[PDB]
Design a protein around this ligand. Structure first.
Ligand SMILES: [Mg+2]
Length: 88
RNA sequence: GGGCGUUAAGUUGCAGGGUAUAGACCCGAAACCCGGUGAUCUAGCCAUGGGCAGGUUGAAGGUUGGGUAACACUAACUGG
């Protein structure tokens, strides 16, 4: 997984408030990260029909939690995705 | 006793009949062997030049959108 030194960084950048691991801004970023990284890893082997599942489980959550914004505070949704370019 | 012999005179020319050896009365093979001339036709190849009116179909690749976590994938336009 992402280095312990990593998550603690991204959070202080996306976390709705100074140092907080829970809000979508923080949730998403923390997820998209491991997703972008693993992408390369999977570009290798590509036979790990197990590790890939996790890739899905978390990715399936990305689009999932991302909806919470719409269903709730939409004002940030677009402001959050525009950050990682997600959705496209 | 028997077989072959012993009272046939030959031989050398010349003309001729026949034979042997040679092409052997004459004309005729299909082929065999030897040494040369031929790839200006044609078969293959080698180098170097040239030729193919018009009309048609429309692959791969690509750009865009859709699409997938990323690919797959998909539809147009292009491309040829
Ligand atoms: Mg007698």
């Amino acid at each position: 997984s992402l280095s312990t030194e990593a998550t603690a960084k991204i959070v202080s950048e996306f976390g709705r408030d100074a140092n907080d691991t829970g809000s979508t801004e923080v949730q998403v970023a923390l997820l998209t990260a491991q997703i972008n990284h693993l992408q390369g890893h999977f570009a290798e082997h590509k036979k790990d029909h197990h590790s890939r599942r996790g890739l899905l489980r978390m990715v399936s959550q990305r689009r999932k939690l991302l909806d919470y914004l719409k269903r709730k505070d939409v004002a940030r949704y677009t402001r959050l995705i525009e950050r990682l370019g997600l959705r496209r």
